């Protein structure tokens, strides 16, 4: 009945975050649209917005990697783009020392909140480092909205 | 028309967690009030409660820091205080910068759940170490409720 979406990362899309709804246990209904990898708000109102991303790497590089994940709003009325929800994670404090085992690491990031949105607004679930994204298994990376 | 809240950390308040609603993409409506930095429940019912906090530091100190974040309920009927949702993070698993100079770390904490609350109940988003909080950018630290 109410505008819903629960889009999942496309496992077919190599090294990039592409949202997909044409899958089992995924939603896009009651006006919610997926245009240019963004969720389009069908009507004015309160929406619960959420997203999860899972990062994976093998060992630690010389560069101090900072993994970020945000849900941004493009408000069509003002033609403005802002970050509604954002989180940062540092997976590596120290680089793997001299011929050591490049042990796999995993970092989940969850974002969620209630926001008053306007009809036509575009929400994006963005990551600065998509090459660190893990969509090997279902349920690890998703982005959704629900009108309340 | 349902009781709502999505308060955000005041960037003007230095080294402390002060909730604010008088901002864009922030909510406080339909009975929900923000007094003495807490959210007061306006009516009996089920509420989705959520909060996010982002902790940041520049290297690791001598003390073993444990960062905690909880949503507590003061139930006015019984004059009792309990932790509804809680999470703990250890940012520095020893890894003290000995020799060279510090690199920034980031730790996000998300809490969310559905609870039956009573009118007049006071909800607090509490952190043991507010000095580690990061509100440099919008969407990093928030606290909210919505009646279902």
């Amino acid at each position, epitope marked *: 009945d109410k505008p819903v979406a629960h889009v999942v990362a496309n496992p077919q899309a190599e090294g*990039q975050l592409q949202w997909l709804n044409r899958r089992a246990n995924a939603l896009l209904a009651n006006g919610v649209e997926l245009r240019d990898n963004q969720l389009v708000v069908p009507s004015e109102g309160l929406y619960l917005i959420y997203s999860q991303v899972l990062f994976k790497g093998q060992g630690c590089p010389s560069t101090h990697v900072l993994l970020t994940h*945000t849900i941004s709003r493009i408000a069509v009325s003002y*033609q403005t*783009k802002v*970050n509604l929800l954002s989180a940062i994670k540092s997976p590596c404090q120290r680089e793997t020392p001299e011929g050591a085992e490049a042990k796999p690491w995993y970092e989940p990031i969850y974002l969620g909140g209630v926001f008053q949105l306007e009809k036509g607004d575009r929400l*994006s679930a963005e990551i*600065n480092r998509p090459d660190y994204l893990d969509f090997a298994e279902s349920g690890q990376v998703y982005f959704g909205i629900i009108a309340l | 028309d349902k009781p709502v809240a999505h308060v955000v950390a005041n960037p003007q308040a230095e080294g402390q967690l002060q909730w604010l609603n008088r901002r*864009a993409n922030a909510l406080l409506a339909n009975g929900v009030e923000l007094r003495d930095n807490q959210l007061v429940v306006p009516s009996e019912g089920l509420y989705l409660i959520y909060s996010q906090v982002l902790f940041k530091g520049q290297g690791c100190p001598s003390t073993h820091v444990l960062l905690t974040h909880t949503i507590s309920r003061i139930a006015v009927s019984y004059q009792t205080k309990v932790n509804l949702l809680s999470a703990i993070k250890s940012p520095c698993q020893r890894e003290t910068p000995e020799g060279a100079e510090a690199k920034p770390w980031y730790e996000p904490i998300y809490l969310g759940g559905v609870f039956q609350l009573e009118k007049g109940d006071r909800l607090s988003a509490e952190i043991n170490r507010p000095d580690y909080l990061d509100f440099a950018e*919008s969407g990093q630290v928030y606290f909210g409720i919505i009646a279902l």
Partner: nanobody, 121 residues
Framework: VQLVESGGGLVQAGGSLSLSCSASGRSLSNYYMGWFRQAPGKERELLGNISWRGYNIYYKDSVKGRFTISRDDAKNTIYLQMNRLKPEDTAVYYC????????????????WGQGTQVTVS
């Protein structure tokens, strides 16, 4: 993170212009890099951004189809190709970088260039 713009100046209306921005610092692959502009007496606006290896691209609706943003990760340089310039494009153009997507409400975790003037007509 330090940002230095180049290009700009004057162009006749309907003309073209290209701006560059060179970044210096540690792990620049973590940053979204982009462009803002601010016209005299008008509010500062985000034009767009590009993250490492061009995985995220954003264009403000008003410049979509005429402005192109590109990134050279070997040179740590971003470019703003501006076509069919109109008098309303007269502003100071600023290069910006942030580990979070750039926003029309920038915070203390966004780095800025010195700004470059572009005058159209």
């Amino acid at each position: 993170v330090q940002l230095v713009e180049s290009g700009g100046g004057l162009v006749q209306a309907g003309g073209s212009l290209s701006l560059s921005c060179s970044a210096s610092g540690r792990s620049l692959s973590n940053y979204y890099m982009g462009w803002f502009r601010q016209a005299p007496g008008k509010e500062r606006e985000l034009l767009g951004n590009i993250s490492w290896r061009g995985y995220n691209i954003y264009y403000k609706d008003s410049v979509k189809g005429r402005f192109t943003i590109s990134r050279d990760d070997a040179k740590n340089t971003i470019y703003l190709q501006m076509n069919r310039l109109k008098p309303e494009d007269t502003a100071v153009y600023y290069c910006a970088a942030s580990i979070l997507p750039l926003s029309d409400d920038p915070g203390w975790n966004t780095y800025w260039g010195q700004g470059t003037q572009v005058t159209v007509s």
